[PDB]
């Protein structure tokens, strides 16, 4: 890995980091010049290689370039009181104002030759502070701005530039040992080669290690109720816990990407309001399998594999898991007995990726000793097209509206078909793992409380194996084919209990209930799978 | 929320932000300086509150501090080359220069009072960089270094420093007409009042939505195979994907911080080399249930909820799970039948966290037709304890070493007791969820590649089930207890097939073996677990 045919200009290059960038450069067929400068052209030169000196200030640039990496510098560590004119001015002039005016000069010949490799040197004093050092980071972090923008003008001709980051009392012998400009040089090198395609990078580096640096933005929070109210300070005060949670902090490429967000935000506060939730939803097919265990699936059929092995051909979700995200929105907060559940799938569903969804009330009605809310939820991948309706049904102890999905009562006959399952008396300890982490679905101290004598399965476990049998028996185990699902959950199932499932075929919708054996009882009421 | 009590000084609060602070600060309690001021102060005034003006430049700071917001701007946009002596030079004096001479002025009337807020105002465009405005991104990186120290040098006294990030063609009415300044005046209200305890803090905020910024570093890369080796271009290059993966990319509060890792780099450098291994293990109660089930616990078992549900008051792991770390990492690459297993507890297990694992290969054999590599591997939590020695034996087709953990043939006389786990035939397709994803134990096309009839139980799992008999047996099923446990991998087991754990107690020792029922044959042989 060569630099024939290349020059290069270091700054700084009487000593330490520039000194060394001088050497490598010139020992790998690059002709270089060494902006003190006498002594290490001669010892360039006698290793056997082609360097020239220069004399001349940073400051003054054009005469310094008649590959550019930028190291001179200057301290003047002062505290902030006592930082003056000429200590502030002689830190910025050197390392800001001098890597601009080298950079300046430098540019032309590198765009109308279509190469360039550019570098910046900041430190961790600008990145992170440092006492009694104003002047100082100041100028390093004003370097990675300057970076920023010389990257972006260099970009569409080859032209890149990229940002170095070289890291009392006594130090450990191997730390002071290894913190040696020699180990740092290499980077700098290989940024500054021709295979090299990082643009606006900030590298890391010292004691032969390196890393990368960059900004990221938290998700943040609206700060007004609607679009129709103003910013006050207490509501700021209020949800800046969420302003500056940086538990799903991501990094933006370009300043379009910051700019583009707002209009979301916006558009969403308008659509509804701040009467709405919102949260993420993770998955792969850990989860994707998971859930179908949970459900009963079973390698035992060799129809289920698809569900099961996520090297499988036709590895897919069986389409009941997309409840979740809209579950586990509607029960984190609130703003509680499951009775009805709708789901429907709009769109080609994925085995992977990150879900938005969100939250709203849709109708509220009230039954003499209790209320019932109906909550609807949307699901969109990533890129924002909409995979996912949730419709949920809930009862609060203690004349429904349009776009409220109704019950459809069994056809008055019987079933065309049925299909019986065993669940295990770990039922509700495994589907538990899909995210519904309710106590009386395992803990006999909880179930009590919440009046059942010993801990019930989920509802939408035994909703799993009800769409289990329907697609088994009605579409071929193809989840491709599978609409919606819509049910009344109208008993308790016990771990352990075996579940009937009758189903009737009328064209496309195929209605079913669910029966636990043992006692007789219906558990899946007025229900139905539209089929595609 | 009141500003009762407070003097506030806004720089260019003649107009857009500045004003608002202006106006917001006063109709809060305030009295505020206006550094065009004139009509501002009349309208504070009229407003019914108290306000001065103030006509001087912010390179003067001294005469406009005898609370504050350095806002004040100028804007000189031009190209890289076209950007001249006084288009550098004003941009930054005005941004950069004037922000520190005007805190320079007010800090110590800040600090002597032992309450203080200062505010820079930086952008997106330093940030991310934009196209021809070199000089203004310079200048508004800049004063994210300056803010930087200055939050450090007054963080004792309560003086805090923060940075607001305030964000052609046509924009849409509904962003244009959010896009305005009175909806940012609240943050930087919120920024600057007494129960405001952020400080170096990077606050982005538009449109009534706000956002917190900060830097993050990745994990990095190593560039020498060993200490006593130099640092390569060749090397940079082909560990540069490492450098910057920013996958496990983390946010450094100090620069002792930054500082204080490299010892670690290179102390676990020079204790071995780049001949071992390293990567990152997350778990929770997910995991741990996920995989207690995964080898047979069950709610069934009173003594087993401890393992199977998160809020259990004496909730812990199964021990066993602790080989998964080991395990994953030594698989991950090469640098294979798994044939003897080694686990060492060493410090109390926790029930979550992200534990640091390494891989090194500890002894090479060779047995004729096959060579044995025993690989050894340790866990250690976040702060640094170790928790976990595995050592593991593998035999690749086609005299041991001290520290080589030796097999103990079974006491010669009958079990002093047995125990009987029936399998189901989706205990691998379970199991695999840990993460052993081999898919000889789920599909019958790579089981048979393998040399398999039928997929397989993870021999894994068989030793899970074998560690919960000896715990439920000789420990009252506490995890606490379980020192250790050694293994050899003796023959297959089918998922379905019923397991007999014989035990024989000595001492601290129980030795053990695991038969598979129906067909009378051993399956784990030479076995041990310590307890404590």
Redesign the interface.
């Known amino acids: 890995?060569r630099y024939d045919g290349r020059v290069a200009v270091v700054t700084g290059a009487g000593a330490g980091l520039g000194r060394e960038y001088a050497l490598?450069f010139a020992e790998?067929g690059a002709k270089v010049v060494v902006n003190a400068a006498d002594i290490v052209v001669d010892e360039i030169r006698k290793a056997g290689g082609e360097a020239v000196a220069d004399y001349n200030s940073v400051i003054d640039g054009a005469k310094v370039i008649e590959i550019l990496v930028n190291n001179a510098g200057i301290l003047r560590d002062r505290?902030?009181?006592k930082?003056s004119e000429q200590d502030?001015n002689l830190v910025?002039d050197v390392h800001?104002?001098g890597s601009?005016k080298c950079?300046?000069a430098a540019?032309?010949y590198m765009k109308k030759q279509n190469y360039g490799r550019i570098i910046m040197t900041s430190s961790?004093?600008?990145?992170?502070?440092?006492?009694?050092?104003?002047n100082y980071?100041?100028?390093?972090?004003?370097?990675?701005?300057?970076?920023?923008?010389?990257?972006?003008?260099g970009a569409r001709n080859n032209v890149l530039c990229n940002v170095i980051v070289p890291?009392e009392g006594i130090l450990?012998d191997?730390?002071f040992n290894?913190?040696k400009p020699?180990?740092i040089?290499?980077?700098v090198?290989?940024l500054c080669?021709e295979?090299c395609e990082?643009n606006?990078?900030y590298?890391?580096?010292?004691?032969?290690?390196?890393?990368?640096?960059?900004?990221?933005?938290?998700?943040?929070?609206?700060?007004?109720p609607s679009?129709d109210d103003?910013?006050?300070?207490?509501?700021?005060?209020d949800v800046?816990s969420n302003?500056?949670?940086?538990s799903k902090?991501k990094?933006?490429?370009?300043?379009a990407e910051?700019?583009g967000t707002?209009?979301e935000?916006?558009?969403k506060l308008?659509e509804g309001g701040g009467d709405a939730i919102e949260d993420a939803f993770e998955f792969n097919s850990?989860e994707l399998?998971?859930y179908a265990?949970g459900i009963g699936a079973?390698?035992?059929n060799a129809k289920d594999m698809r569900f099961?092995?996520?090297?499988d051909a036709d590895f897919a979700a069986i389409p009941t898991f997309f409840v979740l995200p809209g579950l586990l929105l509607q029960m984190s907060t609130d703003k509680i007995l499951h009775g009805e559940q709708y789901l429907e799938i709009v769109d080609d569903l994925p085995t992977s990726g990150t879900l938005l969804t969100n939250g709203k009330v849709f109708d509220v009605m009230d039954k003499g000793s209790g209320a019932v809310v109906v909550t609807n939820s949307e699901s969109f991948d990533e890129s924002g097209r909409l995979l996912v309706r949730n419709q949920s049904t809930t009862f609060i102890v203690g004349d429904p509206i349009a776009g409220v999905v109704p019950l459809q009562p069994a056809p008055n006959r019987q079933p065309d078909a049925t299909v019986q399952y065993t669940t295990?008396?770990?039922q509700?300890?495994?589907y538990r793992?899909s995210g519904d982490?309710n106590?009386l679905h395992?803990?006999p101290q909880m179930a009590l409380l919440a009046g059942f004598k010993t801990?019930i399965l989920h509802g939408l476990c035994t909703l799993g194996f009800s769409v289990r049998a329907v697609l088994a028996q009605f579409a071929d185990n193809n989840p491709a084919l599978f609409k919606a699902v819509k049910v009344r959950f109208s008993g308790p199932v016990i771990?352990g209990q075996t579940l009937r499932v009758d189903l009737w075929k009328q064209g496309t919708r195929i209605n079913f209930r669910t029966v636990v054996v043992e006692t007789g009882k219906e558990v899946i009421s007025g229900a139905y799978v539209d089929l595609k």
Chains 1, 2 share one sequence.
């Open positions: 890995l490598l790998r505290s902030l009181v930082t502030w910025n800001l104002k601009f950079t300046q540019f032309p961790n004093s600008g990145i992170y502070g440092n006492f009694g050092q104003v980071t100041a100028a390093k972090m004003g370097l990675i701005g300057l970076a920023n923008t010389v990257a972006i003008e890291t450990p191997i730390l290894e913190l020699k180990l040089a290499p980077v090198a290989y080669h295979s990082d606006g990078s590298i890391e580096s010292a004691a032969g290690w390196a890393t990368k640096l960059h900004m990221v933005r938290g998700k943040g929070a609206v700060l007004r679009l103003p910013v006050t300070i207490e509501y700021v005060k800046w302003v500056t949670d940086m902090a990094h933006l490429g370009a300043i910051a700019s707002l209009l935000v916006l558009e308008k850990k399998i998971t265990l079973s390698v035992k099961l092995y996520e090297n295990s008396e770990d509700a300890a495994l793992l982490k106590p395992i803990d801990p771990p």
